[PDB]
Amino acid sequence: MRHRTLSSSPALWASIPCPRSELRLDLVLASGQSFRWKEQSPAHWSGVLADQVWTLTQTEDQLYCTVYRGDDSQVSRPTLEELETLHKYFQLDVSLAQLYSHWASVDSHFQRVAQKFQGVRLLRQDPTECLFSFICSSNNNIARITGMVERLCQAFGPRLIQLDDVTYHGFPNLHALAGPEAETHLRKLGLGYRARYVRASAKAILEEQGGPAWLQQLRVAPYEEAHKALCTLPGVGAKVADCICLMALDKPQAVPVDVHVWQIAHRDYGWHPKTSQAKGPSPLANKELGNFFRNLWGPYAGWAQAVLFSADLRQ
Numbered sequence: 001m002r003h004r005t006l007s008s009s010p011a012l013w014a015s016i017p018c019p020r021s022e023l024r025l026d027l028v029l030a031s032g033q034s035f036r037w038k039e040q041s042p043a044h045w046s047g048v049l050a051d052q053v054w055t056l057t058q059t060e061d062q063l064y065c066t067v068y069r070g071d072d073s074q075v076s077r078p079t080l081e082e083l084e085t086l087h088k089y090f091q092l093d094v095s096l097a098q099l100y101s102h103w104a105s106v107d108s109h110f111q112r113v114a115q116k117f118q119g120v121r122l123l124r125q126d127p128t129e130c131l132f133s134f135i136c137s138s139n140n141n142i143a144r145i146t147g148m149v150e151r152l153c154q155a156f157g158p159r160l161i162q163l164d165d166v167t168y169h170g171f172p173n174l175h176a177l178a179g180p181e182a183e184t185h186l187r188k189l190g191l192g193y194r195a196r197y198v199r200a201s202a203k204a205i206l207e208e209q210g211g212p213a214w215l216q217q218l219r220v221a222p223y224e225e226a227h228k229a230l231c232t233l234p235g236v237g238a239k240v241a242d243c244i245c246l247m248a249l250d251k252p253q254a255v256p257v258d259v260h261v262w263q264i265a266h267r268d269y270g271w272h273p274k275t276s277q278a279k280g281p282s283p284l285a286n287k288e289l290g291n292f293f294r295n296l297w298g299p300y301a302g303w304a305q306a307v308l309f310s311a312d313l314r315q
């Protein structure tokens with residue numbers, strides 16, 4: 001079986017009304033939110049959503065998708081429920097154009113960036129996948145995380161399907177990452193020190209918190225409670241926790257503060273720590289800077305900063 005194109009097999013694709021100002025696949029799918037999408041052919045993005053593989057492409061006004069179900073399921077267009085899953089994945093109920101104008105109303109820097117970089121929105125990811133992805137993110141770039149995640153999924157998760165030479169796996173369950181040889185194997189897969197955090201966090205969630213239902217509870221808890229709970233996990237501090245809050249636990253106000261956000265705040269906003277005394281990063285000054293951004297942009301500050309990240313990844 002081959003990766004589909006809109007030309008190859010137009011009968012297997014469905015469409016979701018979606019303007020380019022609401023979503024640009026190319027500024028979202030490989031801009032360091034999910035690490036599981038790859039443009040296997042030009043303008044066609046393939047990756048795994050929940051134990052199914054999808055290919056996505058778009059026109060100026062339409063999002064086209066096709067689904068591969070794997071197990072000798074006779075090929076067919078996406079069902080309604082599968083299309084709802086995708087609609088919810090891209091959080092398309094939320095108007096990005098209205099958010100853009102609201103941020104721009106208070107921020108002339110954002111206003112200039114947003115001209116060129118429209119359609120940057122936040123995926124709504126599976127908490128398990130997002131958590132271990134961002135554990136892998138420490139001192140790491142998107143390309144290297146992407147490989148670590150692909151090798152992790154091939155080694156520990158269920159095979160779904162092969163298309164061309166790419167074999168697609170589901171993200172593993174916690175119990176699979178918690179096992180006695182897991183760290184050893186994960187070091188063999190190139191994760192380094194991060195192998196220890198992966199295994200230890202899997203074991204902590206399972207044994208201390210009662211399994212992945214805990215992550216669903218964090219999704220309904222308040223931002224501040226979810227963040228703090230995540231920071232109890234091995235390898236998860238304020239930055240990683242804010243990533244997971246923003247991207248998987250429905251906390252749009254979470255602003256992950258790292259060196260890159262510091263540089264943006266200083267360079268582009270002229271920000272310096274007020275209350276804090278540190279000239280540079282510190283847990284307190286990092287907290288202060290996240291508060292600065294929420295004060296500026298509002299309850300969707302995490303989405304705003306995502307535009308600036310995506311913008312910066314493009315030269």
Ligand SMILES: NCCc1c(-c2cccnc2)[nH]c2ccc(O)cc12
Pocket residue numbers: 031032033137138139140141142145243256258260261305306309
């Ligand atoms: N300030 C950037 C933090 C960050 C994001 C991110 C993407 C979109 C929204 N918010 C944060 N993705 C990453 C991937 C690797 C990495 O080393 C850092 C990041």
Ligand code: NI
Pocket residue numbers: 266272
């Ligand atoms: Ni200065």
